[PDB]
Every structure is written in structure tokens, then in C-alpha cells.
Amino acid sequence: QVQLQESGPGLVKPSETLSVTCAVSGVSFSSFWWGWIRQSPGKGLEWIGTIYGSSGRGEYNPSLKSRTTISRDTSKSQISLELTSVTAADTAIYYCSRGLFQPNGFSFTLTSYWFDVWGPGVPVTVSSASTKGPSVFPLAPSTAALGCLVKDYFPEPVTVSWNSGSLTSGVHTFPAVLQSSGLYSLSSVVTVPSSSLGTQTYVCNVNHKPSNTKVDKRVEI
């Protein structure tokens, strides 16, 4: 029935405007309320605002109300979120959603919004950092561990395989941590028999699409 689909950029610079779009379908867009919800990398879910499909009127989060503008477009059956003067704090996954409400009986008042359908959400990162490829450094010493250090790159993500993907057993690629410099950094390790060391070859394949850089690094003793 109802199907949502968020759209928008991946990168926004601080102080600029964040614009994401949501396409609804499989229902009368004018007969329901639609809005935006977001979740920050570690912080919880945060409702931004919801509006009526017909009038475009609605309600915003008081904490974001001054910077928020949720518009509608009946043609595309589409709503848009214009968040002005963003900072790193506005880095989040942005979901589109339908806002149902109920009579808070017996009064002629209404409940607030609960959400029966969400979109997959679009990720958006706010940063002034420039595009930069990672530096790859090897991590070396019956069982033995080894890996690669992929650091000082922007933006997310980097991909890391071992022996062109032919080595996956015991592999662990850690989530990227945002260093104080605005650049990201992670490590990828893999457990291997210490007996095969010195003979077996281990190469981590680091690929950073948003900056072309494709690096193969052989991890030795």
C-alpha cells in the first residue's frame, strides 16, 4: 500500500541549508499527514515536524522550529525538509513518515502523532572537511592476528577486503571513529594460523570510492 522513498544529498557544509525530499505513493497524498524523523549517529530518534497533505499547515519540533521548513508538492505527492544553518549536530539518518493522530476523547482535542509507515531513510553528514583518501598502514605482530589501519579519510565509507575477498574467515572490520580532525579512521583485522605466516601472503584491499583511491597493502612479519 503506502510506500515512502527519501532523497537528498550526502554532504552539507556547516551554516548551509540541508534539503531532503520524500516521495509518497500508493495512497491519496492529500488525505493524510506527512513528516520527518531523524536519528543521530549515537543519539536517539528525533521528530522534526509533520504537515497536512492538503493545506501544508503543520507542526514543528520547538527545538528545531526556527530552522525548519517542511513544504509539500501535490503534483509529485512529495514533501521536502529545508533545515537552515546546519552544524555537525544535524548529521543523521533522515526518515520520511506518515503522522496518524487520534481523538483524545471524550474531549474535542487530539493526540499527537504516531507513525505507521516509515521510509528506508537517507543518510546525511554535515561537515566542512574536504574529500581525502585514506592512509593504509599494516598491523602485524598457534594462532596469530594481523590487520590494516585505514585512517585520515573523508567522507565515509571505506571498503576493506582481504586477498580480494578470498579471505573472510575470522575477518573483523571495525566501525569508523570520527577523529578530532574531522577525518575518519578504522582498522580491519583477521585471525590466521601462526604456522602459515612467512609463507602465506596477506593483502588488505582498501577502496575509497568517493576519492578514487584504491590501495592494496601486504601485511608482513
Binding site: 493524510f32 497536512y52 493545506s55 493522530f101 481523538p103 487530539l110
Partner: peptide
């Protein structure tokens, strides 16, 4: 008008 829209939606 907001509350008015709200109730119009439900009917």
C-alpha cells in the same frame, strides 16, 4: 485552521 485541518482529515 490547524485543528480544523486535523478534524477534517479524520472525517
Amino acid at each position: 485552521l490547524l485543528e480544523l485541518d486535523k478534524w477534517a482529515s479524520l472525517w
